[PDB]
Amino acid sequence: MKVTKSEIVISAVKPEQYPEGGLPEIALAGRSNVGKSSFINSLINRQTLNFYIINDELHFVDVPGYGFAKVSKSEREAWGRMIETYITTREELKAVVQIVDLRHAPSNDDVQMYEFLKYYGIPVIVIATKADKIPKGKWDKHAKVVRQTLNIDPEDELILFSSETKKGKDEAWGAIKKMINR
Ligand SMILES: Nc1nc2c(ncn2[C@@H]2O[C@H](COP(=O)(O)OP(=O)(O)O)[C@@H](O)[C@H]2O)c(=O)[nH]1
Predict the structure, then answer these.
(1) Where are the domains of the chain?
(2) Which of 44, 62, 157, 164 could form a disulfide bond with 3, CB atoms 3.0-4.6 angstroms apart?
(3) What are the beta bridge partners of residue 51?
(4) Phi (first) and psi of residue 69, to 5 degrees
(5) DSSP secondary-structure letter at 65?
(6) DSSP annotation of 70
(7) DSSP letter at 107?
(8) Rounded CA separation 145/161 (Å)
(9) How many Å lie between the centroid of ligand 1 and the Cα of residue 33?
(10) What are phi and psi of 148, to 5 degrees?
(11) Is domain 1-182 given the CATH code 3.40.1280.10 in the classification?
């Protein structure tokens, strides 16, 4: 997608705050510091659920990074409610881009998130980023580990990505498009 417009529209602490209009939504989730914000900025050339209007045709919905253990119990609880509410009630949601680090096996938190999404029948685009930190010759090895750890559904997608080199950008947009026009 040639992005000519992208800007935050709301930072929702509650579902009442979600934007109206009914445009398709693609939510993004991953471990804190995995490279989610870098992934977003790459695609568009640049305690709340943040909605970004893209080209006035869809919203990216950025979910606060998970797996950061130095968080209060109340914050973790709030995070859980927020995502559970969103995932289970949002009709506009077409897919979640789950971003993981290609360098290592996905974590227990990644697996939990993936299992949660599949439980609710949510289409997922798995992005394994930081690919540039691994020799090209090992990309397949590391991708196989990601695939087997999450046990990725064959209808989901696994795309290797790098915010450094923009590897995966076109493929990621292409997948978002398939998900939106399902
Ligand atoms: N080498 C490399 N570094 C990356 C990549 N993506 C993110 N980073 C770096 O990893 C750190 C965390 O990335 P960031 O997008 O801020 O993480 P976020 O917390 O998930 O939003 C930053 O220092 C980024 O520069 C990538 O694909 N390749």
Answers:
(1) 1-182
(2) 44
(3) 10, 61
(4) -75, -15
(5) P
(6) S
(7) P
(8) 15
(9) 6
(10) -70, -30
(11) no
